[PDB]
């Protein structure tokens with residue numbers, strides 16, 4: 001029986017937008033917001049099974065920017081009051097014989113200056129010898145980063161939304 005392990009990588013950035021508005025727009029309204037403002041990034045998001053809570057299975061189809069590829073996510077948890085959203089990658093290019101699943105956690109933390117700290121944890125569920133490239137991981141972190149800036153810009157330009 002092959003070695004089962006977990007490789008954990010955590011990363012953070014800041015936003016001028018405080019957690020309640022950021023969690024409502026960027027996290028809870030991702031399916032509707034991102035295809036609408038960034039069609040090149042996301043073509044659409046479709047719920048396959050569930051209502052939007054824990055256990056929900058959803059397929060995200062990318063735009064031209066990611067060669068109309070796609071990812072399938074399972075929602076592992078949602079804590080609206082603490083701004084925590086957990087989900088697993090259950091179908092995607094990042095999975096292999098070596099990486100069977102990636103569980104992510106996005107947590108919004110408030111700061112005293114009125115902003116947010118966006119804390120992203122990636123947990124890679126490994127099988128056998130572990131061979132994880134820093135370039136492969138950091139391209140995934142850059143990806144999430146440049147997209148967030150499009151969301152942040154839009155929310156600043158449309159202050160009446162997600163209040």
Ligand SMILES: [Cl-]
Nearest residue numbers: 139140142143
């Ligand atoms: Cl990238």
